[PDB]
Design an enzyme around this catalytic site. Structure first.
Site, mmCIF file in Angstrom:
data_model
loop_
_atom_site.group_PDB
_atom_site.id
_atom_site.type_symbol
_atom_site.label_atom_id
_atom_site.label_comp_id
_atom_site.label_asym_id
_atom_site.label_seq_id
_atom_site.Cartn_x
_atom_site.Cartn_y
_atom_site.Cartn_z
ATOM 1 N N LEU A 22 0.800 -1.229 0.000
ATOM 2 C CA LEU A 22 0.000 0.000 0.000
ATOM 3 C C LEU A 22 0.804 1.234 0.000
ATOM 4 C CD1 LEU A 22 -3.034 -1.028 2.166
ATOM 5 C CD2 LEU A 22 -2.729 -1.424 -0.122
ATOM 6 N N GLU A 30 -8.906 0.512 9.224
ATOM 7 C CA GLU A 30 -9.270 0.420 7.797
ATOM 8 C C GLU A 30 -9.192 -1.035 7.289
ATOM 9 O OE1 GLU A 30 -10.456 0.869 4.039
ATOM 10 O OE2 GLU A 30 -8.398 0.083 4.344
HETATM 11 N N1 LIG Z 1 -5.438 -0.018 -1.836
HETATM 12 C C1 LIG Z 1 -6.206 -1.099 -2.135
HETATM 13 O O1 LIG Z 1 -7.414 -1.195 -1.875
HETATM 14 C C2 LIG Z 1 -5.559 -2.158 -2.962
HETATM 15 C C3 LIG Z 1 -4.193 -2.110 -3.277
HETATM 16 N N2 LIG Z 1 -3.686 -3.095 -4.091
HETATM 17 C C4 LIG Z 1 -2.242 -2.831 -4.479
HETATM 18 O O2 LIG Z 1 -2.231 -2.888 -5.865
HETATM 19 C C5 LIG Z 1 -1.036 -3.607 -6.326
HETATM 20 C C6 LIG Z 1 -1.489 -4.933 -7.026
HETATM 21 O O3 LIG Z 1 -2.310 -4.545 -8.198
HETATM 22 P P1 LIG Z 1 -1.961 -4.564 -9.622
HETATM 23 O O4 LIG Z 1 -0.504 -4.269 -9.791
HETATM 24 O O5 LIG Z 1 -2.992 -3.832 -10.340
HETATM 25 O O6 LIG Z 1 -2.008 -6.119 -10.014
HETATM 26 P P2 LIG Z 1 -3.210 -7.270 -10.057
HETATM 27 O O7 LIG Z 1 -3.523 -7.718 -8.675
HETATM 28 O O8 LIG Z 1 -4.277 -6.884 -10.966
HETATM 29 O O9 LIG Z 1 -2.328 -8.435 -10.746
HETATM 30 C C7 LIG Z 1 -2.122 -8.376 -12.122
HETATM 31 C C8 LIG Z 1 -1.813 -9.837 -12.581
HETATM 32 O O10 LIG Z 1 -3.107 -10.504 -12.371
HETATM 33 C C9 LIG Z 1 -3.541 -11.240 -13.601
HETATM 34 N N3 LIG Z 1 -4.776 -10.626 -14.073
HETATM 35 C C10 LIG Z 1 -5.243 -9.393 -13.729
HETATM 36 N N4 LIG Z 1 -6.447 -9.285 -14.244
HETATM 37 C C11 LIG Z 1 -6.741 -10.464 -14.912
HETATM 38 C C12 LIG Z 1 -7.829 -10.872 -15.634
HETATM 39 N N5 LIG Z 1 -8.922 -10.086 -15.798
HETATM 40 N N6 LIG Z 1 -7.799 -12.115 -16.123
HETATM 41 C C13 LIG Z 1 -6.750 -12.938 -15.924
HETATM 42 N N7 LIG Z 1 -5.644 -12.553 -15.246
HETATM 43 C C14 LIG Z 1 -5.693 -11.295 -14.780
HETATM 44 C C15 LIG Z 1 -2.280 -11.129 -14.349
HETATM 45 O O11 LIG Z 1 -1.550 -12.271 -14.158
HETATM 46 P P3 LIG Z 1 -0.841 -13.149 -15.308
HETATM 47 O O12 LIG Z 1 0.242 -12.359 -15.930
HETATM 48 O O13 LIG Z 1 -0.391 -14.329 -14.556
HETATM 49 O O14 LIG Z 1 -1.882 -13.467 -16.331
HETATM 50 C C16 LIG Z 1 -1.662 -9.805 -14.105
HETATM 51 O O15 LIG Z 1 -0.272 -9.748 -14.488
HETATM 52 C C17 LIG Z 1 -0.206 -3.871 -5.118
HETATM 53 O O16 LIG Z 1 0.604 -2.672 -4.800
HETATM 54 C C18 LIG Z 1 -1.277 -3.942 -3.999
HETATM 55 O O17 LIG Z 1 -0.769 -3.612 -2.670
HETATM 56 C C19 LIG Z 1 -4.417 -4.186 -4.570
HETATM 57 C C20 LIG Z 1 -5.746 -4.248 -4.219
HETATM 58 C C21 LIG Z 1 -6.367 -3.235 -3.429
HETATM 59 N N1 LIG Z 2 -10.719 -0.803 1.744
HETATM 60 C C1 LIG Z 2 -9.687 -1.668 1.420
HETATM 61 N N2 LIG Z 2 -9.895 -2.413 0.342
HETATM 62 C C2 LIG Z 2 -8.914 -3.332 0.069
HETATM 63 S S1 LIG Z 2 -9.004 -4.339 -1.239
HETATM 64 C C3 LIG Z 2 -7.490 -5.161 -0.797
HETATM 65 C C4 LIG Z 2 -7.055 -6.259 -1.538
HETATM 66 C C5 LIG Z 2 -5.791 -6.701 -1.122
HETATM 67 C C6 LIG Z 2 -5.117 -6.117 -0.085
HETATM 68 C C7 LIG Z 2 -5.603 -5.029 0.628
HETATM 69 C C8 LIG Z 2 -4.632 -4.540 1.681
HETATM 70 N N3 LIG Z 2 -5.229 -4.285 2.912
HETATM 71 C C9 LIG Z 2 -5.330 -5.384 3.585
HETATM 72 C C10 LIG Z 2 -4.391 -6.386 3.294
HETATM 73 C C11 LIG Z 2 -4.498 -7.554 4.001
HETATM 74 C C12 LIG Z 2 -5.511 -7.621 4.953
HETATM 75 C C13 LIG Z 2 -5.673 -8.840 5.755
HETATM 76 O O1 LIG Z 2 -4.800 -9.719 5.874
HETATM 77 N N4 LIG Z 2 -6.812 -8.744 6.377
HETATM 78 C C14 LIG Z 2 -7.346 -9.734 7.312
HETATM 79 C C15 LIG Z 2 -7.708 -9.129 8.681
HETATM 80 C C16 LIG Z 2 -7.055 -7.799 9.115
HETATM 81 C C17 LIG Z 2 -6.441 -8.107 10.484
HETATM 82 O O2 LIG Z 2 -5.491 -8.969 10.536
HETATM 83 O O3 LIG Z 2 -7.033 -7.560 11.457
HETATM 84 C C18 LIG Z 2 -8.701 -10.244 6.776
HETATM 85 O O4 LIG Z 2 -9.362 -9.623 5.824
HETATM 86 O O5 LIG Z 2 -9.057 -11.203 7.495
HETATM 87 C C19 LIG Z 2 -6.421 -6.606 5.259
HETATM 88 C C20 LIG Z 2 -6.345 -5.456 4.558
HETATM 89 C C21 LIG Z 2 -6.902 -4.542 0.306
HETATM 90 C C22 LIG Z 2 -7.716 -3.481 0.821
HETATM 91 C C23 LIG Z 2 -7.584 -2.534 1.832
HETATM 92 O O6 LIG Z 2 -6.570 -2.368 2.670
HETATM 93 N N5 LIG Z 2 -8.582 -1.703 2.171
#
Ligand SMILES: NC(=O)C1=CN([C@@H]2O[C@H](COP(=O)(O)OP(=O)(O)OC[C@H]3O[C@@H](n4cnc5c(N)ncnc54)[C@H](OP(=O)(O)O)[C@@H]3O)[C@@H](O)[C@H]2O)C=CC1
Ligand SMILES: Nc1nc2sc3cccc(CNc4ccc(C(=O)N[C@@H](CCC(=O)O)C(=O)O)cc4)c3c2c(=O)[nH]1
EC number: 1.5.1.3
Length: 186
Positions: A22, A30
């Site tokens: 993150l 959160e």
């Molecule tokens: N702040 C938040 O709420 C969140 C933060 N994050 C952050 O975002 C980053 C990860 O996201 P991001 O980099 O976008 O990567 P993704 O999690 O989207 O991973 C991308 C890989 O997933 C596969 N992929 C993605 N979409 C598809 C699809 N529709 N169909 C098939 N395969 C797919 C691919 O793998 P392949 O090449 O093997 O096909 C691609 O290379 C990290 O920094 C993480 O901490 C992630 C979620 C939430």
């Molecule tokens: N609004 C929001 N959307 C997303 S969507 C998304 C997708 C991937 C990763 C994150 C990163 N934030 C995390 C990462 C890991 C955990 C986890 O291990 N969590 C445990 C319990 C927490 C605990 O141990 O008390 C769990 O759910 O049991 C919880 C939050 C988020 C993420 C986010 O941070 N926030």
């Protein structure tokens, strides 16, 4: 199968990730919000399914994978099987959502939660149909290298209340944030 949902936390400059984690330091309440939303199932004997890209899977600490109490599905075209600890693997979002209609899952799955990253959010975010976005607005800019796609507000209505979502400003580690829920149906 019940509703389709995305959940995310995003900075002001629309950042969601930096270097596989993150952009901001850990916000423990959160993270608990994410757990609570994604795990709580409104339907007896069902659990929610989480859909994520492969880098998002590997971004969750190994101790905390799979996300407990949820069925975990990873999207990848390179992987040949689910990663260690994951339950399902699909090759496209359409495939994953079709899978929830198969005999294995049809009666097991309540809500579907898209949990990232950017490409799956963007495709889900343009999936015609009824969809909600649970967005945490982290009220600061943070250097990022992954971003949340644009929310088209003509179609995504910000809801003026939602049960179980606090409406006031939150603050942890000096960082203010607020919770939002958006809904479209098209
Ligand atoms: N702040 C938040 O709420 C969140 C933060 N994050 C952050 O975002 C980053 C990860 O996201 P991001 O980099 O976008 O990567 P993704 O999690 O989207 O991973 C991308 C890989 O997933 C596969 N992929 C993605 N979409 C598809 C699809 N529709 N169909 C098939 N395969 C797919 C691919 O793998 P392949 O090449 O093997 O096909 C691609 O290379 C990290 O920094 C993480 O901490 C992630 C979620 C939430
Ligand atoms: N609004 C929001 N959307 C997303 S969507 C998304 C997708 C991937 C990763 C994150 C990163 N934030 C995390 C990462 C890991 C955990 C986890 O291990 N969590 C445990 C319990 C927490 C605990 O141990 O008390 C769990 O759910 O049991 C919880 C939050 C988020 C993420 C986010 O941070 N926030």
């Amino acid at each position: 199968v019940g509703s389709l949902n995305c959940i995310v936390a995003v900075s002001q400059n629309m950042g969601i990730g930096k270097n596989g984690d993150l952009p901001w330091p850990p916000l423990r309440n959160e993270f608990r919000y994410f757990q609570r939303m994604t795990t709580t199932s409104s339907v007896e004997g069902k659990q929610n399914l989480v859909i994520m890209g492969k880098k998002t899977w590997f971004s969750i600490p190994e101790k905390n994978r799979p996300l407990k109490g949820r069925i975990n599905l990873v999207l990848s075209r390179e992987l040949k099987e689910p990663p260690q600890g994951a339950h399902f693997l699909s090759r496209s979002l359409d495939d994953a959502l079709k899978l929830t209609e198969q005999p294995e899952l049809a009666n097991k799955v309540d809500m579907v939660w898209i949990v990232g990253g950017s490409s799956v959010y963007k495709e889900a975010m343009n999936h015609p149909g009824h969809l909600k976005l649970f967005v945490t607005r982290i009220m600061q800019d943070f250097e990022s290298d992954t971003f949340f796609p644009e929310i088209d507000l003509e179609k995504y209505k910000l809801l003026p209340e939602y049960p179980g979502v606090l409406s006031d400003v939150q603050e942890e580690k000096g960082i203010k944030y607020k919770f939002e829920v958006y809904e479209k149906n098209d």
